[PDB]
């Protein structure tokens, strides 16, 4: 219908202008807090900021998109047509590849366990343009239905299609698979370490309650068997604050020595419990509360704060991935099925709905850093305090 597509053509440009100004403002804020501080920046954060400037370069083009959607035809040249449609393509592959190497960096720092960062940034920015060279050469303002539009068309055989499919798979299916594999292994690693910290701590207290009400030596041996196995496993636990540190660090050696004392007090109580002594085994288990409160619970809450901080840190970049994979995914599926096949109101409506959905993503990323971000929110108040004087 002409009325429904005109309703979409009126809905698009002011949402485009609002998204342009909001994404532009939030992105300058992210950039200035990235540039004004260097001692706190991280490698994953270098990627996070590159995706930011990429959406700045995208956000400078929505005035042209708003003008062309308001006029109803590509008032511009075919040259600009590809100019814009490539900028959006390098935004897409910059987002995909930067989140892919964010996933690999977090896989290295979590599952497997910088002066050369600019070379890595220049590699990703280039690879995006390479996978966008097909977008640059395949899009030219043409004429259909009496109006000029900025859209790609497969016309005049083997080289074009071959490279198009190759680059497509290399930048989309391959990375996405790397991302879901790395993020599932990270989530399974961090949640198991939450479980291994808790269940080793759960049985070091629950079985201590069984000792005080056992009334014979038979249950004291079976309770202390589980606590010697729990304290041996909990000594082997590597916290994320000590995962990057050396295994022979002096901070870890105090944590291991507390479990070298705690198992030796289980061993003293097990030595009494095998002799049939029930009162002396419970009394030797009273010193197990003393050492836990002075060696282990000090390192339990330090590990339970660092591990949950990493879960808090991993939940904002997966949400950054999931927002990027909810906005920029259905628009590229629309532009792939149109080139694959070469009522009618539904196709034009779903084209424009995903057109404004993927273009919204330049606003949705500074939204996530302000809401569930743990580094941008603290340092945005830092630069606001230094200027409000």
């Amino acid at each position: 219908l002409q009325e429904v597509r005109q309703f979409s053509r009126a809905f698009v440009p002011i949402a485009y202008s609002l998204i342009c100004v909001f994404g532009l403002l939030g992105n300058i804020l992210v950039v200035i807090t990235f540039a004004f501080y260097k001692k706190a920046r991280s490698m994953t954060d270098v990627y996070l900021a590159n995706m930011a400037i990429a959406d700045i370069l995208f956000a400078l083009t929505l005035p042209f998109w708003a003008v062309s959607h308001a006029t109803g035809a590509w008032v511009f040249s075919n040259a600009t047509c590809k100019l814009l449609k490539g900028i959006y393509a390098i935004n897409f592959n910059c987002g995909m590849w930067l989140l892919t190497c964010i996933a690999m960096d977090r896989y290295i720092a979590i599952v497997q366990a910088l002066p050369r960062s600019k070379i890595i940034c220049l590699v990703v920015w280039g690879l995006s343009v390479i996978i966008s060279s097909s977008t640059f050469v395949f899009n030219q303002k043409y004429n259909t239905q009496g109006s000029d539009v900025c859209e790609p068309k497969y016309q005049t055989i083997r080289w074009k299609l071959l490279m198009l499919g190759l680059e497509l798979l290399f930048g989309f299916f391959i990375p996405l698979m790397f991302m879901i594999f790395c993020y599932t292994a990270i989530v399974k690693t961090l949640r198991r370490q939450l479980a291994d910290l808790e269940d080793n701590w759960e049985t070091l207290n629950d079985n201590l309650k069984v000792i005080e009400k056992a009334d014979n030596a038979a249950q004291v041996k079976d309770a202390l068997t589980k606590m010697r196995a729990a304290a041996l496993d909990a000594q082997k636990a590597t916290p994320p604050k000590l995962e990057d540190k050396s295994p022979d660090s002096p901070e870890m050696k105090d944590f291991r020595h507390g479990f070298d004392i705690l198992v030796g007090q289980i061993d003293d109580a097990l030595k009494l419990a095998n002799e049939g002594k029930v009162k002396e085994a419970q009394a030797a288990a009273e010193q197990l509360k003393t050492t836990r409160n002075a060696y282990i619970q000090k390192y339990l809450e330090r590990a339970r704060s660092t591990l949950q901080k990493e879960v808090k840190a991993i939940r904002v970049i997966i949400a950054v991935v999931l927002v990027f994979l909810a906005c920029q995914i259905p628009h590229n599926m629309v532009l792939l099925v149109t080139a694959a096949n070469l009522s009618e109101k539904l196709i034009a409506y779903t084209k424009t709905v995903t057109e404004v959905l993927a273009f919204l993503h330049c606003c949705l990323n500074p939204v996530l850093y302000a809401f569930i971000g743990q580094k941008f929110r603290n340092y945005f108040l830092k630069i606001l305090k230094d200027l409000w004087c």
Partner: antibody
Framework: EVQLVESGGGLVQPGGSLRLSCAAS????????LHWVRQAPGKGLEWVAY????????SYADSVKGRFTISADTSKNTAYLQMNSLRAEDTAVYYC?????????????????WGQGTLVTVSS | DIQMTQSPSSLSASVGDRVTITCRAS??????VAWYQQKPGKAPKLLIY???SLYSGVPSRFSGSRSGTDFTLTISSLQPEDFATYYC??????????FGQGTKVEIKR
Amino acid sequence: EVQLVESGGGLVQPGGSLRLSCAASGFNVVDFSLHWVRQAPGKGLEWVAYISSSSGSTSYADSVKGRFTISADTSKNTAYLQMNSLRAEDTAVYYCARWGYWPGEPWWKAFDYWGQGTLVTVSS
Amino acid sequence: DIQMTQSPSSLSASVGDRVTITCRASQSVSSAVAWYQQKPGKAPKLLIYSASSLYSGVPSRFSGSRSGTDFTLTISSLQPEDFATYYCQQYLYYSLVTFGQGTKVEIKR
């Protein structure tokens, strides 16, 4: 050169008594806990008893409790196993193995050096 | 108390093969599992201690792993001189030692 040498395994009657003298060399008794693992002919390894002569913590398996008595002395640097009221099920090859004290690495090396064993045949 | 279950009680392999013996603990035995090799008529010899660590004098083809209460001994390349019986043993405590039932590795024919 660290080694454990068993002796005293032989031929006894049911209900008899014999002492197996596991000697040692190259290391002392009070820095290594000595255990007895026996192996019946055609069967697997079964733990029997242990002693920690630095303190004295003689524990036994439930099949040998009361009848068996493990002992050691550090002047001669040997270990002993006094077995009484033997049945046909005690016919085995008796190994003595050393195992270090908690904490550190030598506790984790469980039974790193074994003795060659002595055969005890209990039959009427 | 704590039981030890060694699954492949008879194993047939040839020279150059890759072997895998699985031992499982009844309770939580927390990496306190050793592996032993015994030739017939001889004392056992420690191969892998602490469920993964390779003992000195043991060649690098032998290896160990732990996945919870499941434990695994692996020989990568099987030489003719390691046709013997293999025992797993939990050692959570001095008085708590229980061995596996034993797996004998024979020549494939």
